[PDB]
Amino acid sequence: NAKRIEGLDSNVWVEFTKLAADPSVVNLGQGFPDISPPSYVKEELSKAAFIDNMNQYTRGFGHPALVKALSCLYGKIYQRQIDPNEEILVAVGAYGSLFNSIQGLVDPGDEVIIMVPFYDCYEPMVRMAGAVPVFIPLRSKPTDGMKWTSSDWTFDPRELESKFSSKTKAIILNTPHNPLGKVYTRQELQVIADLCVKHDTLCISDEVYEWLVYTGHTHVKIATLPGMWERTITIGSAGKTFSVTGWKLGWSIGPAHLIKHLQTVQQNSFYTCATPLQAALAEAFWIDIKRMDDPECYFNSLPKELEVKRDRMVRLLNSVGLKPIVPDGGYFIIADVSSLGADLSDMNSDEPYDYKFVKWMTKHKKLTAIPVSAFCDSKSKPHFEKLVRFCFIKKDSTLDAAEEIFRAWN
Amino acid sequence: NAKRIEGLDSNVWVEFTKLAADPSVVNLGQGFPDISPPSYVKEELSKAAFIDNMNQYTRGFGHPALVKALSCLYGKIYQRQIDPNEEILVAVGAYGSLFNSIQGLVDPGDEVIIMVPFYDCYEPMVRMAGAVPVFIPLRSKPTDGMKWTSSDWTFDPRELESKFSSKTKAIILNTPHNPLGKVYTRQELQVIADLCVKHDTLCISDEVYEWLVYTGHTHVKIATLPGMWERTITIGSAGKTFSVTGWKLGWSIGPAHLIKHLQTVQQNSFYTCATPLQAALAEAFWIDIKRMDDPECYFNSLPKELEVKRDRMVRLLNSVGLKPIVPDGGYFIIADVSSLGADLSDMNSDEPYDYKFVKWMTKHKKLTAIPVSAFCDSKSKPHFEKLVRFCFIKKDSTLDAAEEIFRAWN
Ligand SMILES: Cc1ncc(COP(=O)(O)O)c(CN)c1O
Ligand SMILES: *Cc1c(COP(=O)(O)O)cnc(C)c1O
Ligand SMILES: [Ca+2]
Numbered sequence: 001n002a003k004r005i006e007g008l009d010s011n012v013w014v015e016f017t018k019l020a021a022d023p024s025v026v027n028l029g030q031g032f033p034d035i036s037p038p039s040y041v042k043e044e045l046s047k048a049a050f051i052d053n054m055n056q057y058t059r060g061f062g063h064p065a066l067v068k069a070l071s072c073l074y075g076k077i078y079q080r081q082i083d084p085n086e087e088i089l090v091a092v093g094a095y096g097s098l099f100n101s102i103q104g105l106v107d108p109g110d111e112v113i114i115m116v117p118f119y120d121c122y123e124p125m126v127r128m129a130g131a132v133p134v135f136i137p138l139r140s141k142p143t144d145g146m147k148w149t150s151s152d153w154t155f156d157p158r159e160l161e162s163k164f165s166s167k168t169k170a171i172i173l174n175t176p177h178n179p180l181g182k183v184y185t186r187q188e189l190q191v192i193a194d195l196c197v198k199h200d201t202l203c204i205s206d207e208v209y210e211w212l213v214y215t216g217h218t219h220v221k222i223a224t225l226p227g228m229w230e231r232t233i234t235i236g237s238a239g240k241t242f243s244v245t246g247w248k249l250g251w252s253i254g255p256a257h258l259i260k261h262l263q264t265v266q267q268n269s270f271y272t273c274a275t276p277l278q279a280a281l282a283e284a285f286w287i288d289i290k291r292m293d294d295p296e297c298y299f300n301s302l303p304k305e306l307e308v309k310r311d312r313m314v315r316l317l318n319s320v321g322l323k324p325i326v327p328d329g330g331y332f333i334i335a336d337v338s339s340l341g342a343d344l345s346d347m348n349s350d351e352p353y354d355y356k357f358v359k360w361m362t363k364h365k366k367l368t369a370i371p372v373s374a375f376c377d378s379k380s381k382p383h384f385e386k387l388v389r390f391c392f393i394k395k396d397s398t399l400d401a402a403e404e405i406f407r408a409w410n
Numbered sequence: 411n412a413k414r415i416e417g418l419d420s421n422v423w424v425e426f427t428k429l430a431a432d433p434s435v436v437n438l439g440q441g442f443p444d445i446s447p448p449s450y451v452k453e454e455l456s457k458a459a460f461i462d463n464m465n466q467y468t469r470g471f472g473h474p475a476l477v478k479a480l481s482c483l484y485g486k487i488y489q490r491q492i493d494p495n496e497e498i499l500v501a502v503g504a505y506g507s508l509f510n511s512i513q514g515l516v517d518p519g520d521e522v523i524i525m526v527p528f529y530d531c532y533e534p535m536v537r538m539a540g541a542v543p544v545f546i547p548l549r550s551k552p553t554d555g556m557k558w559t560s561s562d563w564t565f566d567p568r569e570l571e572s573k574f575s576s577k578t579k580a581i582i583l584n585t586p587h588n589p590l591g592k593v594y595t596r597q598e599l600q601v602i603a604d605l606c607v608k609h610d611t612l613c614i615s616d617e618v619y620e621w622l623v624y625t626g627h628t629h630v631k632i633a634t635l636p637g638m639w640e641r642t643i644t645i646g647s648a649g650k651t652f653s654v655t656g657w658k659l660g661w662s663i664g665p666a667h668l669i670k671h672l673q674t675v676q677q678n679s680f681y682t683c684a685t686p687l688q689a690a691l692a693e694a695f696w697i698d699i700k701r702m703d704d705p706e707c708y709f710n711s712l713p714k715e716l717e718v719k720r721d722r723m724v725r726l727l728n729s730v731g732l733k734p735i736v737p738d739g740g741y742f743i744i745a746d747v748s749s750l751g752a753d754l755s756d757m758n759s760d761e762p763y764d765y766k767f768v769k770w771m772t773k774h775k776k777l778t779a780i781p782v783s784a785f786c787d788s789k790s791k792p793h794f795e796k797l798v799r800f801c802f803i804k805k806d807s808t809l810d811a812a813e814e815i816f817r818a819w820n
């Protein structure tokens with residue numbers, strides 16, 4: 001094995017295969033939606049399949065129709081013109097987008113700042129590039145009293161400051177957050193912005209869940225703050241936008257001098273993404289772009305649907321004594337489990353508490369979830385191992401099945 | 411810009427956004443087929459599109475149905491049992507597979523041996539991993555007197571031996587060959603095998619055009635030669651097998667201790683490939699695997715269909731005094747361009763002769779093709795700069811259009 005991938009071979013998701021196996025569990029682990037994608041999205045792929053051309057090579061950096069659509073939509077959001085050719089790169093999901101960014105902008109020996117918990121792929125990506133991850137935890141503040149929420153989690157600005165040195169190449173932002181469901185405030189993005197301009201550093205911003213924010217919160221794009229356009233790469237994904245996760249298409253939006261470096265990586269790695277998926281997606285985007293103001297638009301209906309399902313989950317977890325953190329956005333809910341004193345002690349390995357809890361819950365209660373320590377570097381695990389994450393982008397029937405398990409819990 | 415991509419930003423194909431533009435001209439440039447894909451390939455995408463789960467995440471290293479099918483087809487070919495999970499890896503095209511091999515197996519300072527002309531991505535891939543490309547040209551032998559063919563090209567064994575040293579990590583082989591259409595012989599493959607065993611080095615075998623073998627030649631896989639299985643990665647593609655270049659799906663077949671390393675690269679880069687695409691591809695395979703002995707099998711029908719078109723091209727090229735090199739395989743044909751008139755000081759730079767010619771033939775004759783010098787290291791271009799590459803995976807209509815211009819050359 002090449003030196004660049006020394007000890008990058010284990011992967012949380014690989015390890016989680018033998019969990020979801022057994023047919024009769026209700027899987028609330030993986031971010032596998034089992035609702036239907038919008039009908040028009042399925043239809044458009046079918047339509048694309050029967051056109052010859054759309055089954056051949058398209059433009060390497062993205063299908064013209066797609067990049068046209070994206071530049072239209074994000075033009076609206078940034079309130080500025082987005083160049084479809086120079087300021088956008090279409091890649092294999094947000095994974096690929098992340099990988100482009102890091103591969104093309106981050107050198108060996110550079111520091112990259114990561115907030116914990118993080119989407120687990122951040123650490124190995126930065127490591128393979130020969131770069132050093134510098135970790136900083138999110139910490140809880142006190143509750144309003146009545147509710148525990150994603151918004152009761154923040155970072156210490158003075159702590160954050162001290163993580164930037166002349167060795168900081170970049171910071172990785174994830175709002176809405178996986179796994180907390182935190183929707184970063186303007187003030188919080190202002191602190192991060194301030195520092196990248198003070199230290200002349202990049203900001204990579206994972207914003208795949210941009211559409212999934214719930215009432216009382218607003219997705220704010222760091223890249224839109226003063227001084228940030230020139231220094232930010234902002235990521236987005238078709239799986240998350242169209243509930244079509246198996247399409248594996250994402251985009252990186254940012255300034256032409258940073259985006260060029262990502263395109264250099266792409267052309268030297270896989271080059272093109274599939275034509276029919278891009279063709280189909282372009283059309284979906286036009287369908288929903290042309291109706292952004294209406295409740296019908298998928299960018300509106302989907303959070304509306306999920307906010308309901310979220311609230312069902314707060315209750316189901318509360319019902320069994322699990323203490324949930326109600327998320328401002330996204331489709332994951334983190335629950336604290338330490339208040340059940342569970343009948344483990346005797347999976348005997350040196351796993352964190354939460355991997356154990358989930359194993360127990362699968363064998364005994366017929367339900368899977370993801371341990372939050374899967375999203376933490378070593379030093380961080382003990383400070384997060386009583387937390388367990390559940391996914392709610394599920395259809396009614398599934399959440400029913402979940403409800404049956406919780407009601408039968410004692 | 412990160413050091414690892416330094417001066418890798420020039421891409422040959424980005425540059426052929428030259429006079430590709432003019433709508434009037436017949437493009438025999440890029441390997442963009444305008445034949446229809448086999449109608450069942452299109453149906454299965456459509457069918458897959460309407461299944462909800464086929465639009466969500468699948469197994470990261472390859473859709474289970476697709477690896478099962480690859481396992482079955484290739485185990486017939488290899489005369490061995492191939493593990494679908496441990497010995498295959500589905501990647502975003504052959505491009506993706508190549509990148510997975512280099513990144514996963516090659517360190518800074520290794521030497522990788524490449525044969526010239528080479529498919530152009532081989533050079534910067536090896537460069538991006540900080541390895542040093544080591545070039546060896548293909549050379550002409552005296553012809554049989556009658557015609558010029560790909561089999562009249564080959565390499566000096568003693569010259570090859572001399573490129574092997576203790577710094578050699580791998581050799582890249584591409585049969586059938588792009589751009590000359592050379593089908594490597596058992597004797598030639600035996601030389602490469604010998605040196606790989608003797609020096610303990612990897613072979614990466616770009617076999618995308620494997621079904622495109624013409625009359626009186628046979629695809630043989632180096633991986634089946636004694637001692638090769640355990641040191642060979644053999645690459646395939648959907649775009650070539652099913653004339654569906656826009657699907658961007660390929661695979662690496664090899665031993666587990668090597669495949670595991672490609673998997674590490676994948677999971678830390680794009681992870682999962684498109685589900686609807688992979689589901690449909692598997693189906694397409696089963697259709698054809700079940701009828702191999704039959705002339706309807708796309709495997710048998712496509713090369714048969716294409717051979718006619720190859721000969722058509724040879725005639726057309728002869729008929730205007732371009733000396734065709736008749737290809738044993740794949741869908742590209744090189745013509746020696748040098749005994750024409752062709753004015754050429756109307757340009758006056760000293761970018762290579764074949765680029766000048768292609769610009770000339772585009773403007774003056776409304777026909778594009780690819781200069782062979784594009785596929786050569788700088789030291790090598792003088793020796794291939796009077797060579798031009800034409801693609802013939804085209805529909806009758808297009809070879810009619812081409813024949814109009816060849817009839818109208820003089
Ligand atoms: C020899 C060779 N290898 C690899 C590729 C890349 O193909 P894919 O689109 O499957 O990545 C091509 C493109 N025709 C090729 O000619
Ligand atoms: C699921 C997820 C991804 C992966 O995105 P794809 O577009 O499916 O490649 C990336 N980032 C975050 C924060 C995620 O939750
Ligand atoms: Ca090792």
Ligand SMILES: [Ca+2]
Nearest residue numbers: 080081082083
């Ligand atoms: Ca502009």
Ligand SMILES: [Ca+2]
Nearest residue numbers: 166199200201
């Ligand atoms: Ca600095």
Ligand SMILES: [Ca+2]
Nearest residue numbers: 576609610611
């Ligand atoms: Ca050796």
